[PDB]
């Protein structure tokens, strides 16, 4: 419940997870460290995180193959100022992260961007996969995965998956199928509230 | 109740109107049918409408109910914002509902509404009943008292207010009903007495 | 659809310099409450602080609270 | 040039012996408009005790420059004297300018207001007026709290130095002057913030800041969310309306104001627009439902600040209360429950909150938040669930919480009590694999390349 | 100033009104007042252009810029030209007695030339 030194590291997860709009990819290569490390602080003690949930769906809107036009969750969404978001570069493959994306570079080029983009886009949609795993129960589930359903039909789109590659497509709509699965799992299973069913005193 | 001497209603705050006699520890008539919190309600006065309510609710409905059937209403109107204040005409045909910034009068011999008159910027609270049966006085929380006719109903007169005011009636001396003095309380908490003496 | 409810929030158990409990009885009913003080003694303290019989417990200010909680520490400073 | 300064406070002293004992007279008055232009230079050097010599000289100027008793001092050399203080690129002469003359004395207030407005009738000094402008907090309450002038205070009984209708008359016109002029954006997310504390009760009328706040506010954004105190200060003292104002709330409280940095005035202003008597039971479980659901992805200092908001709502409008403990009263309903599972009847993205459907949902998402990782959280979104004892929370003990004061939280304890750790600690923390132990891998390793 | 006098000619106020004519600042307001309480505002201004004469400078300059904002705005109302006319009327009676003023005027302007110039040579004896 209480650690006087476990969870403060969970508080400095939070505070960089839940603020910090992203000015560079070193950034969203370091909320996405953070996102998992705080799922594995999570794990077998089902609680929830509400800004790596906000701070996910923010980097898989703000990869950007065309636009959040609207109706995107009710999470902040903001700007990809320097052009940090995907490019029709659909033959670079899916790799995975090293560390050394935490370090800023100016002066990258941008087929150094795009499997770095690619990668942060197949980790994301890991961290989801495993986020809905571990979090089907807590009946706000479809209120709160609502959005990565709705996030992710949206970068199933025609001038969205121009950019991707079939990989990419490929885990998006096992995303999609998966999130389905476990949305009407948790509509047939939600019950109304009767908290307040109390023992009168003697 | 205007006629009977141990009859009263009651609009509470959770659906219901309900009829007491003062006898019994008991309510004689349940209604229900409102969905929101029902806070002004009246008798319809009448030699034919014996045992006629209407309440208006928060929930832009304004209802008549008979007595005799507690069903549910013989006549609803439904409006657009909610309904802060109600008052009958003394003949017993129209009937007023102050509903946010406009009032509106409806006739109850054919259900029908006749007229939305909207001559105030906040929401209209009290309603009252003026000169001869002859001039309603509206108060709003605008600080405005507007007194309107009856058979043309135009913005006949009106005052200003340093409050925004929730209660407003004009008073009557006694035999044939000269109106003494208006009183309006405000929010500011203060009963403001206008006295004319004739 | 906007009123003031400054004041309907006054039904409430105010806390005092011993009794952690005072609801609104009236301002000479709820100073009875307080251990040591009396009926006769309560309305000597109401007459010096310009405090109306009238009013309850909790229609009073922040201010015109604590008015009332220096005057029973010391009863020889104000007069009597 | 200290010897200079010290040959003015000389010169200072014989001008005013001089003015205070009094063909032959016109050098006597060429002095001071000789002097006048060395204390304009020396306004530009320590200018702080030259500001103490030009603001003696006006006392001077006003006690003997006249046959008459009325002291009349120069506004036009006064004018100058504003006119190089607000232009000089110097912070602390305008400091002691502020600190020492205009908020402690009223005379140089109502003419510093009316040498402004015609300064600036005629982009950094729009800076240095504004931060004067910002600078006269305190404003009169009455005409006897006054009470204190520098030169001449009037035994006139109705002029405009002793009536506050004036005072508030020049200063509603040097801010008229100054917002005609046109401000920047850090000067109106300035003024905003500071308005109805500071600026709205400087008005005699203040009916144009009524059409400028309403523009602000109609706009959007969180410039809104600066103005919605502003237009609270508007209905409230002289009661101009806003059209729909509690849609208008609605539409305001949205996707990302919980993370902004103004929430805390912002709930602070919400609590007296939900303590209103006249609401229905819809709008306030309106506002609560979409406060729930925007607290899903709320910050936990926010949540700590919504629940105990909800705590006394839930007090106040029981008809609420069907959003914490509903019951299917028919057993078919029972029936139709467990055949299919219930879907929210709550519209989010309504427009108005009287038909938004939020009575008969429920608070699934307070009973969600309650597994928060925080602990305070999580106790905190338990007195929903456990028992309604206390009759009230104040909001003042849980408003102005932070990510330093949660982080400091941990800090202000004791160092250790002794902690626990964990036993039988794996070796392949790092491995990819480690196919030998069956233990599976960490998720991290798993998606993280080391190598 | 808009929203205001909007409010005042909507719900018929006198001191919001008074308040805002008392008073660029005039330009703004009438630009961002409503269409529909334009005649309101102009029945509003004859009324007080008749009930006090000493107020003409700035009511004829709130009608002015009235009619210059707000023309064609009349026209699509158009069963409302009976407002106009109040105000043909008003500012007719305004225009009324013309011409015997001016030549009291020019009887006037003659006595004060004389007391001019012999102030004039008062000064400089």
């Given at each position: ?71 995107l ?9 320097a052009g ?30 795009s ?38 039909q ?47 005193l003697? | ?49 014996s ?54 009068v ?8 006749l ?84 | 659809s ?55 417990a ?11 909680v220096?005057?029973?520490?010391n ?6 | 040039?200290k ?17 205070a004992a ?5 050098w ?23 500001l ?15 046959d ?17 203080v ?40 729009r ?77 005699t ?12 506010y ?101 008809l ?27 519209l ?46 104040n ?26 750790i ?30 | ?14 001191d ?19 269409s ?34 707000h ?55």
């Amino acid at each position: 419940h209480f650690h006087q030194v476990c969870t403060p590291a969970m508080l400095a997860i939070a505070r960089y997870l839940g603020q910090k709009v992203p000015a560079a990819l070193s950034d969203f290569a370091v909320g996405i460290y953070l996102s998992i490390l705080a799922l594995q602080y999570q794990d077998f003690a089902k609680r929830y995180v509400p800004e790596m949930m906000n701070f996910l769906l923010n980097t898989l809107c703000a990869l950007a193959p065309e636009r959040a036009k609207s109706k995107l969750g009710n999470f902040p969404v903001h700007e990809p100022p320097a052009g940090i978001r995907i490019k029709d570069a659909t033959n670079t493959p899916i790799r995975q992260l090293n560390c050394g994306d935490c370090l800023r570079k100016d002066e990258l080029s941008p087929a150094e961007t795009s499997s770095l983009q690619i990668a942060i886009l197949s980790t994301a949609t890991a961290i989801l996969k495993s986020a809905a795993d571990t979090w089907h129960k807590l009946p706000a589930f479809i209120e709160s995965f609502q959005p990565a359903l709705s996030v992710a039909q949206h970068l199933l789109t025609k001038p969205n998956a121009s950019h991707l590659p079939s990989s990419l497509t490929s885990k998006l709509n096992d995303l999609a199928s998966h999130l389905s699965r476990l949305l009407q799992l948790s509509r047939l299973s939600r019950r109304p509230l009767e908290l307040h069913h109390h023992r009168p005193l003697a | 109740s205007p006629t009977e001497l141990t009859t009263l209603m009651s609009c509470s705050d959770d659906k219901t109107v309900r009829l007491w006699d003062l006898p019994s520890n008991d309510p004689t008539r349940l209604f229900t049918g409102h969905t929101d919190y029902v806070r002004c309600g009246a008798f319809m006065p009448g030699s034919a409408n014996s045992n006629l309510l209407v309440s208006g609710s928060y929930d832009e409905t304004v209802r008549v109910w008979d007595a005799r059937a507690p069903g549910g209403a013989v006549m609803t109107f439904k409006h657009a914002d909610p309904i802060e204040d109600v008052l009958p005409l003394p003949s017993g045909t129209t009937l007023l509902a102050a509903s946010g910034n406009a009032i509106s009068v409806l006739d109850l011999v054919a259900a029908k509404p006749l007229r939305l008159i909207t001559n105030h910027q906040k929401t209209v609270t009290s309603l009252s009943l003026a000169s001869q049966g002859r001039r309603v006085v509206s108060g709003s929380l605008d600080g405005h008292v507007k007194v309107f006719e009856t058979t043309s109903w135009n913005v006949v007169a009106g005052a200003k207010y340093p409050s925004p005011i929730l209660s407003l009636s004009v008073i009557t001396a006694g035999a044939s009903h000269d109106d003494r003095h208006l009183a309006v309380g405000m929010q500011s908490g203060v009963l403001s007495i206008r006295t004319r003496l004739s | 659809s906007l009123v003031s409810g400054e004041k309907t929030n006054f039904n409430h158990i105010l806390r005092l310099l011993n009794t952690n409990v005072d609801g609104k009885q009236k301002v000479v009913y709820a100073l009875t409450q307080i251990k040591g003080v009396g009926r006769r003694y309560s309305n000597l303290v109401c007459k010096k602080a310009d405090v109306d019989l009238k009013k309850r417990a909790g229609e009073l200010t922040s201010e015109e609270l604590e008015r009332l909680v220096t005057i029973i520490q010391n009863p020889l400073a104000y007069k009597i | 040039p200290k010897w200079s300064l010290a040959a003015a406070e000389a010169l200072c002293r014989v001008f005013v012996r001089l003015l205070a004992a009094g063909t032959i007279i016109n050098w006597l008055r060429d002095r001071l408009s000789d002097y006048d232009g060395v204390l304009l230079s020396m306004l530009q050097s320590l200018a702080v005790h030259a500001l103490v010599l030009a603001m003696a000289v006006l006392k001077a100027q006003a006690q003997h420059l006249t046959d008459r008793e009325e002291a009349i001092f120069p506004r036009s050399f006064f004018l100058e004297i504003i006119a190089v203080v607000l232009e000089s690129p110097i912070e602390h002469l305008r400091g002691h300018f502020s600190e020492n003359f205009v908020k402690k004395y009223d005379d140089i207030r109502f003419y510093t207001f009316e040498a402004i407005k015609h300064f600036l009738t005629e982009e950094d000094v729009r800076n240095n007026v504004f931060n004067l402008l910002l600078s006269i907090e305190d404003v009169p309450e009455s005409n006897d709290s006054l009470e204190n002038f520098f030169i001449e205070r009037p035994p006139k009984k109705k002029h405009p130095l002793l009536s506050l209708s004036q005072h508030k008359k020049q200063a509603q016109e040097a801010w008229l002057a100054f917002m005609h002029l046109g401000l920047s954006k850090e000067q109106r997310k300035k003024v905003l913030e500071v308005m109805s504390a500071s600026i709205a009760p400087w008005f005699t009328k203040p009916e144009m800041l009524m059409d400028f706040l309403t523009d602000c506010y109609n706009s959007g954004g969180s410039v809104s969310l600066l103005a919605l105190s502003g237009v609270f200060y508007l209905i409230q003292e002289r009661n101009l309306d806003y059209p729909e104002f509690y849609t208008k709330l609605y539409s305001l409280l949205d996707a990302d104001i919980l993370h902004s940095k103004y929430r805390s005035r912002f709930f602070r202003l919400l609590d007296t627009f939900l303590a209103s008597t006249h609401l229905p039971a819809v709008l306030v479980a309106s506002f609560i439902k979409r406060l729930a659901r925007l607290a899903l992805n709320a910050p936990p200092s926010a949540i700590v600040v919504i629940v105990p908001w909800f705590y006394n709502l839930f007090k106040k409008h029981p008809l609420t209360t069907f959003m914490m403990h509903r019951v299917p009263r028919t057993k078919e309903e029972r029936e139709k429950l467990e055949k299919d599972g219930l879907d929210d009847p709550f519209l989010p993205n309504e427009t108005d909150p009287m038909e938004t459907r939020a009575i008969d949902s429920c608070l699934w998402e307070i009973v969600q938040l309650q597994s928060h990782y925080h602990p305070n959280v999580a106790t905190i979104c338990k007195i929903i669930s456990e028992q309604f004892t206390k009759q009230a929370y104040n909001l003042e003990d849980f408003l102005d919480h932070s990510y330093g004061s949660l982080l400091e939280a941990e800090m202000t304890k004791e160092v250790k009590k002794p902690p626990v750790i964990e036993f039988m600690i794996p070796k392949h923390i790092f491995t990819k694999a480690a196919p030998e132990e069956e233990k599976k891998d960490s998720l991290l390793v798993s998606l993280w390349d080391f190598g | 100033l808009g929203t205001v006098l909007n409010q005042a000619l909507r719900t018929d106020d006198s001191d919001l009104l008074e308040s805002c004519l008392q008073t660029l600042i005039i330009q703004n307001t009438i630009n961002r007042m409503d269409s529909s309480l334009a005649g309101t505002l102009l029945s509003k201004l004859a009324a007080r252009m008749h009930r006090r004469p000493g107020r003409a400078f700035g009511l004829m300059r709130w009608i002015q810029w009235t009619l210059v904002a707000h023309g064609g705005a009349l026209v699509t109302q158009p069963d409302l030209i009976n407002r106009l006319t109040e105000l043909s009327r008003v500012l007719e009676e305004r225009s009324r007695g013309l011409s015997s003023l001016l030549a009291l005027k020019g009887k006037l302007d003659m006595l004060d030339a004389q007391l001019k110039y012999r102030k004039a040579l008062k000064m400089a004896g």
